[PDB]
A paper describes a structure:
The Mitochondrial Complex I Assembly (MCIA) complex is essential for the biogenesis of respiratory Complex I (CI), the first enzyme in the respiratory chain, which has been linked to Alzheimer’s disease (AD) pathogenesis. Here we report the structural basis of the complex formation between the MCIA subunits ECSIT and ACAD9. ECSIT binding induces a major conformational change in the FAD-binding loop of ACAD9, releasing the FAD cofactor and converting ACAD9 from a fatty acid β-oxidation (FAO) enzyme to a CI assembly factor. The inclusion of an additional N-terminal 26 residues in the ECSIT construct (hereafter named ECSITCTER, residues 221–431), combined with optimisation of the purification and subcomplex reconstitution protocols led to a 3.0 Å resolution cryo-EM structure of the ACAD9WT-ECSITCTER complex, enabling us to build and refine an atomic model that includes nearly all ACAD9 residues as well as a 15-residue peptide spanning ECSIT residues 320–334. As previously described, ACAD9 is present as a dimer, where the C-terminal regions (residues 600–621) form helix loops that are positioned around the neighbouring protomer thereby stabilising the active dimer.
Numbering used by the authors:
A (entry chain B), B (entry chain A): 38 to 449, 487 to 621
Write the structure that this text describes.
Amino acid sequence: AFAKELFLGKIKKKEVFPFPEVSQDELNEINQFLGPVEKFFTEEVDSRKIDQEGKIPDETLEKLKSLGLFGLQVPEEYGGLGFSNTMYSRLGEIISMDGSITVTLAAHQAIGLKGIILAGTEEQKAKYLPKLASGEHIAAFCLTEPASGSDAAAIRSRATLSEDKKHYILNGSKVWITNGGLANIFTVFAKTEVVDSDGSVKDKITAFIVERDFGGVTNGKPEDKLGIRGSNTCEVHFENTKIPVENILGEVGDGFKVAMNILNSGRFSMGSVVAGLLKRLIEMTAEYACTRKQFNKRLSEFGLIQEKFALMAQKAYVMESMTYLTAGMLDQPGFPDCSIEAAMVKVFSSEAAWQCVSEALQILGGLGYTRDYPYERILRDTRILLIFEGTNEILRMYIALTGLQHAGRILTHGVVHPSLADSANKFEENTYCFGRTVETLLLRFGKTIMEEQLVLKRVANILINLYGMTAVLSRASRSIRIGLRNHDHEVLLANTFCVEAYLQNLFSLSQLDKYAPENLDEQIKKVSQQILEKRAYICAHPLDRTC
Amino acid sequence: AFAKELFLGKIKKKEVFPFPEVSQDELNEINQFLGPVEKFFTEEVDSRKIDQEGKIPDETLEKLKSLGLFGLQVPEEYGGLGFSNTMYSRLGEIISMDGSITVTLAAHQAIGLKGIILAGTEEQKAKYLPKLASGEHIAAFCLTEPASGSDAAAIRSRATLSEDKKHYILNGSKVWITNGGLANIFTVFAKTEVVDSDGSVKDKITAFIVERDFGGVTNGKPEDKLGIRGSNTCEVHFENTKIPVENILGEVGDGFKVAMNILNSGRFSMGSVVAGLLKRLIEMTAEYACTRKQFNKRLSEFGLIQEKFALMAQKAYVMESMTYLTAGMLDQPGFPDCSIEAAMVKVFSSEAAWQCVSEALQILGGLGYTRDYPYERILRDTRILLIFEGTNEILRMYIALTGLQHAGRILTHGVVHPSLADSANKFEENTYCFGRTVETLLLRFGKTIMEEQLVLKRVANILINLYGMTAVLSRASRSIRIGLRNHDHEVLLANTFCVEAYLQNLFSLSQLDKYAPENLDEQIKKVSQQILEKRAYICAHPLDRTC
Ligand SMILES: Cc1cc2nc3c(=O)[nH]c(=O)nc-3n(C[C@H](O)[C@H](O)[C@H](O)COP(=O)(O)OP(=O)(O)OC[C@H]3O[C@@H](n4cnc5c(N)ncnc54)[C@H](O)[C@@H]3O)c2cc1C
Ligand SMILES: Cc1cc2nc3c(=O)[nH]c(=O)nc-3n(C[C@H](O)[C@H](O)[C@H](O)COP(=O)(O)OP(=O)(O)OC[C@H]3O[C@@H](n4cnc5c(N)ncnc54)[C@H](O)[C@@H]3O)c2cc1C
């Protein structure tokens, strides 16, 4: 991957900078495909009715099955469409208009049946995948226990062999699974004892493809969510579940690798989702500011709405750069390992989504707060993307933790257009200084870097900014060389983000020094310790007096 | 006030560093009153049922009337409680828990009947205030029309003087008037022709105390609000309203000044309302931060949760400093024009509220997004504070130019405790250079500063941070000298805020120079104007290519 090489202080030239280019025929045929898709979301989708009622209408879901979006990444031989990673991102740019169905389909494709394709047996593939991609079967990714979440190694669901050793018995419950109410196939992750030459009785996690027809799998009442009322998040209890031995992934005991790959192979497309959302915002607020008058003038002439529009456009553009570069590096021959960059795209998309949606509702003022306008649904559904597919704080570790281990093992520019000359120099300076800082950080902490949960956050921020800046440089250089329309606008959108990210990175890199007077790590530690040991607020009220 | 002297480069040390101190008898009286108030709010209020149903129950509102809480800033002779400013903030900290009720009370007290006390006559006061503060009459502040929330100098409500000289006739419609559904007294603001010696027929803004019993005033259907569903925000229509000639504030032709003075006196309370929220959150999450297991450890042992808790505590402490210093400035003899400070505290409180509520729901992760937990209600209700009593976006103009206009006319440190030495050494610096910058602006921009609103926003940020830093310095110095419990915790919070605000203000001041390459005023302007002319996102997809 490109991210893993950032820590060593080297930038892989002749790579990333040539932006992924798609030939004409795929683009033409996918416009022919998106015709009906865009039409169907525009006419037949009643977003307000779905959000208010909280139940997806049967006709809409049936038509969605008919268009076959359930198998976008499924290979053609198994009834899928075989769209590449880039094409999935392009279709996800427009799939996000509803807001509720996007989560259901991300659960069905990105994570749900991803396990069968990644590590399932060929017989299991032929048995299940053609029916899953057709839409009759829906996959739900059951991983979390009521007292679980991150660090799923500690699951309390027991699966054990039977006397005849011909079928497994499973008993457990799962709490937060998207589309668990209607799903007919679950990728349950449970625990089972394993025996080896040492005679050990260690317990290891294993996967299980479980149907609702096996019996003993029961569903509870759907949980009344805040924003995406369309999704059907439920409770599943497995009591006395009988599983034939053929329903297992890889080999018994290797559940951690499958779980990690499933989580790490489906977070880049989300980055495009937000981008599409932001487009809709600038398709609805821009107009309003034109039909509303203040200071005897239209709203658009004020500089303080102009800066908000520029910020929204900058976030959308940088987000598109991230998503499409990441989806273009996954289409190379083989199986490249670019799980970090999907995390970068996910984190940046969530942050920019929250900031820009808050600002957009602010521009509409008091009018946007009511439900007559649809800005409620956008704000409520934008929140979940920070929670969805793992929290941002975990991915802040994953970007730093996994990359630094690769960095630790090793220790133990005429490509951009002349118009963007300053951005290349700033990117080179940031990469060099950041490499030196990471080298010093690994030298000083050594192996104790795990507990420095604050340092990893700053390193993750710097890495996300560097990846954003380099993706934007690559996209702008392509747009200039091809001579695409409005190339000066995209040059300005590149330079603004380059200056902003350079300032932020220079701030973050400065406070990662041994003798930095601005290093505010101990103060936060002490204060947080005080509140956490008291478990309430500390400071007494100003009114009270004690001589 | 203290803020107006900041731009000249001089610190009003006598006014703000000796922190306001309440006498023992007054403190005993206020605790005696909060006793029953805290009991009633804790045991009787059913926040979830009010939020879900959207209608305030009759019994709880009647009990609130029995407590006589609708009037507390009312003078004691007019049935009021005669509470001072600091007592209002302290009782706001308590009433902040419900969320729906605080909006109704702010509409009744801070804005609604504030006009009668500020500019009403003795006869009008004796006629209306005793019934208003009793609870059987509620005042609603009608200022906005379908197309006029800001710049009220452009209202289209027509009030004309009848030929008999004894009645005014009023016709108009108002939108987004808090508690307009049940209010029986309106401070309607309209326009009426005025005749002078010059023979002009110009229209001037006038106020009108209007009763529902007059006739021709109709209530529309309540707006279906997003979060604060308890408060009844409705539509009020004035069709042929007859107004007796004695219901005018001040004199005919001074409605704009009365409106401005009403608005500029009720924005410090919600500086501490958020405190009465955030402290509760720092408790409500803290329990959850110790009753869940991850990585085999309590979440409180992680760095990120520690950082979030310290941030929440810091914001709560700074808002306490701002609100109580501002409430102590007002209680001095006379009524100094502290219009800047109230707006400043409001905007800082709103920003910190949004940030901290986002972080707090993030800590609870997937459980917080559920409607069962009360974190959903807090997130939905915290939105209004970026809108209510006018948006915080325009309140960044009063803070920006009300001092510059004051500074324009003029141009045409042993009090702090030694422990907080270096922080004070920063504060003076963060003022001194700042003053120079301001005066340089008054040269370079001449009188054109109004239109270049980005500079105004930057100056607003610098001033807000300076006031926050000086307020926390003064409060921490008082707490050290008196010897309150956990004073070292207060010192740590004060030092953290001083360093953070100094960094942010140095960044803001560094980019206000002409020869600073950190300036983005021109590029943002160009990008925003391009987008606004295009009416939508102008940049195209990267998949599309041109031969
Ligand atoms: C729950 C609620 C409570 C309310 N309470 C009150 C109340 O107590 N009193 C009251 O008077 N109104 C109140 N309002 C009305 C509110 O202030 C809005 O003005 C109203 O909803 C309609 O105004 P608008 O959308 O036309 O505002 P606009 O000003 O048209 O909104 C456009 C946005 O552009 C920006 N902007 C506007 N003018 C300027 C400028 N000159 N310079 C720079 N930026 C600018 C601001 O961000 C503004 O929000 C309330 C509204 C709601 C929803
Ligand atoms: C809509 C939705 C969709 C979901 N989809 C899935 C899914 O596809 N797959 C799945 O497995 N689960 C999924 N979940 C479950 C979710 O990931 C968690 O299991 C759930 O929030 C349970 O609470 P928690 O363990 O995250 O508690 P939390 O306290 O929220 O745990 C995560 C948070 O705790 C802190 N934290 C945790 N670990 C660390 C650490 N090592 N270092 C620092 N801080 C840390 C951080 O603040 C982090 O944000 C979903 C949940 C929801 C609501």
